[PDB]
């Protein structure tokens, strides 16, 4: 029971990013232990209010995972991110969305 | 048939100190959630119109009562016995129990428990089996619970008699959602790759259901064995997302394509063609 597991954080859009076209921003947080965790989705560094998430589940190896998501319209300049806080993390970790 | 083949319930019981613990639970068909546990009310949340399968409301209510009684007594006993096998706070206990339909028609049941994220016990042949990671603590625990009246008998009934008929009822009641076909969309991206003159190509495949899919970088009809599949990631509303990547030398990227095969496509494979020089 002794060893804690830091979260893996993956940020991705439901659809290929196209400026002006509504989309869905997903943040998948997985591999972590224990289950207590805080997750926010950010628009230009501000917490987004209308964010949904799955109920807690876990992998075969007992690591927890959560899916957080919101609708969003990508633009040229707008920045979006996923911000996670967990006992393994000293400060909240911010993974930026990168449509590539 | 397609779609999920198993039902399970999960438990996450978090013990903060001597006096405070809280349990989360839910019910699942493979990775699709069909039940929630509402700790506000000690009742189940039914997430689809068919989530009760072919069970009557009386039987569902009875099962809810069993879980409600278990969730409350579990916490009680764990605390009372946390002094007995020295256990430091905080700690977390996990549990998964359910059954699965196999090729040939057989239904196999399972129950596993974890402590601090390591296997602790399992139920095999309606007996409590301590896992080696659980140490002597898991041995003392199994020897304890088997003495408490009714527990193993109720576990045996749920695992081997109630779960198999629940699974069959709910797999049928939900087949319109469970066995639907949802076509993926696909698209290509690029970006730098480690090492000189190397590129990483990415074939994104999103929105497909059910989960089995085939994605391969190709040269004509030659599958590129260097294709790396990422882990399958969830979208909201029961579809999936997958990245298939290929590390290729610059100047050997031309001629590459990405081919997607999926049960929803009716043999109309998706084929994407990589073009160079910023021609997307
Ligand atoms: C929810 O659905 C379950 C599955 O139903 C079937 O599948 C779904 C998808 C639909 O197609 C349904 O229309 C369909 O029925 C129900 O469970 C199943 O119920 C049937 C009917 O009672 C039952 O069949 C009986 O099986 C026994 C033999 O079972 C043993 O052996 C088999 C191997 O052969 C093994 O798999 C089992 O585990 C057992 O070890 C058989 O003896 C019975 O024969 C008697 O009755 C028939 C008439 O049906 C007659 O012709 C014979 O001559 C003899 O009298 C009968 O064939 C299935 O075994 C059972 N399946 C499972 C996995 O449990 C479920 O029904 C409820 O539970 C049943 C166990 C039984 O108590 C029913 O009366 C209940 O309504 C249904 N509802 C609920 C609430 O679960
Ligand atoms: C092996 C893992 C189990 C270890 C957990 C041990 C800590 C025990 C905490 C629970 C205390 C229970 C209180 C004592 C007895 C319960 O009432 C007893 C039985 O009651 P009895 O008939 O003996 O007496 C009449 C009481 N009623 C009048 C109240 C019915 N019930 C229980 O213990 C509940 C068992 C928990 C089962 C957990 C899940 C098993 C697998 C689920 C598979 C899913 C399939 C279901 C389909 C939907
Ligand atoms: C349809 C009927 C409605 C039911 C809806 C489902 C709700 C599920 C909520 C209940 C979840 C609890 C069931 C989990 C049981 C798992 C087995 O428990 C263990 O493994 C405990 C291991 C103990 C480790 C001890 C240290
Ligand atoms: C166990 O943890 C809970 C918090 O989860 C503790 O609750 C606090 O207790 C202190 C001391 O009595 C109060 O002043 C606080 O107001 C409580 N906070 C909340 C949010 O309830 C509880 O006391 C702890 N128990 C033990 C025995 O340490
Ligand atoms: Cl599936
Ligand atoms: Cl409860
Ligand atoms: Cl019972
Ligand atoms: Cl497409
Ligand atoms: Ni850090």
UniProtKB/Swiss-Prot annotation, chain A:
Quaternary structure annotation from Swiss-Prot or TrEMBL: Heterodimer of an alpha chain and a beta chain. Beta-2-microglobulin is the beta-chain of major histocompatibility complex class I molecules. Polymers of beta 2-microglobulin can be found in tissues from patients on long-term hemodialysis. B2M alone (not in complex with HLA-I) interacts with M.tuberculosis EsxA (ESAT-6) and an EsxA-EsxB (CFP-10) complex; the tripartite complex can be detected in the host endoplasmic reticulum. The B2M-EsxA complex can be detected in patients with pleural tuberculosis and is stable from pH 4.0 to 8.0 and in the presence of 2M NaCl.
Disease listed for this protein: Immunodeficiency 43: A disorder characterized by marked reduction in serum concentrations of immunoglobulins and albumin, and hypoproteinemia due to hypercatabolism. Patients may suffer from recurrent respiratory tract infections and severe skin disease.
Keyword annotations: Amyloid, Amyloidosis, Disease variant, Disulfide bond, Glycation, Glycoprotein, Immunity, Immunoglobulin domain, MHC I, Pyrrolidone carboxylic acid, Secreted, Signal
Family listed: Belongs to the beta-2-microglobulin family.
Domain Ig-like C1-type as annotated: residue spans: 7-95
Lineage top rank: taxon: Eukaryota
Glycosylation positions in this chain: 3, 21, 43, 50, 60, 93, 96
Cystine pairings recorded for this chain: 27-82
Annotated Gene Ontology cellular component terms: cytosol; early endosome lumen; early endosome membrane; endoplasmic reticulum; endoplasmic reticulum lumen; ER to Golgi transport vesicle membrane; external side of plasma membrane; extracellular exosome
Location in or out of the cell: Secreted; Cell surface
First-listed, main subcellular location of the protein, grouped into a coarse class: secreted
Gene Ontology BP annotations: amyloid fibril formation; antigen processing and presentation of endogenous peptide antigen via MHC class I; antigen processing and presentation of exogenous peptide antigen via MHC class II; antigen processing and presentation of exogenous protein antigen via MHC class Ib, TAP-dependent; cellular response to iron ion; cellular response to iron(III) ion; cellular response to nicotine; intracellular iron ion homeostasis
Species annotation: Homo sapiens
GO molecular function, one term: peptide antigen binding
Modification after translation: Glycation of Ile-3 is observed in long-term hemodialysis patients.
Function: Component of the class I major histocompatibility complex (MHC). Involved in the presentation of peptide antigens to the immune system. Exogenously applied M.tuberculosis EsxA or EsxA-EsxB (or EsxA expressed in host) binds B2M and decreases its export to the cell surface (total protein levels do not change), probably leading to defects in class I antigen presentation.
Residues modified as Pyrrolidone carboxylic acid: 4
Protein's name in the database: Beta-2-microglobulin
Parent sequence residues shown: 21 to 118 of 119
Phenotype upon changing residue 62 to G: Decreases tendency towards amyloid formation
UniProtKB/Swiss-Prot annotation, chain B:
Organism domain of life: Eukaryota
Disulfide bonds: 99-163, 128-142, 203-258
GO molecular function: endogenous lipid antigen binding; exogenous lipid antigen binding; lipopeptide binding
Residue span(s) of domain Ig-like: 164-274
Tissue spec: Expressed on cortical thymocytes, on certain T-cell leukemias, and in various other tissues.
GO process annotations (BP): adaptive immune response; antigen processing and presentation, endogenous lipid antigen via MHC class Ib; antigen processing and presentation, exogenous lipid antigen via MHC class Ib; immune response; positive regulation of T cell mediated cytotoxicity
One of the record's GO cellular component terms: cell surface
Membrane topology: Single-pass type I membrane protein
Positions on the Extracellular side per record topology: 1-275
Glycan attachment positions: 17, 54, 125, 237
Subcellular location: Cell membrane; Endosome membrane; Lysosome membrane
Keywords associated with the record: Adaptive immunity, Cell membrane, Disulfide bond, Endosome, Glycoprotein, Immunity, Immunoglobulin domain, Lysosome, Membrane, Signal, Transmembrane, Transmembrane helix
Coiled-coil intervals: none
Comment field (misc): During protein synthesis and maturation, CD1 family members bind endogenous lipids that are replaced by lipid or glycolipid antigens when the proteins are internalized and pass through endosomes or lysosomes, before trafficking back to the cell surface. Interaction with saposin C is required for the loading of bacterial lipid antigens onto CD1B in the lysosome.
Role played: Antigen-presenting protein that binds self and non-self lipid and glycolipid antigens and presents them to T-cell receptors on natural killer T-cells.
Assembly and interaction partners: Heterodimer with B2M (beta-2-microglobulin). Interacts with saposin C.
Official protein name in the record: T-cell surface glycoprotein CD1b
Organism: Homo sapiens (Human)
Full-protein residues shown: 22 to 296 of 333
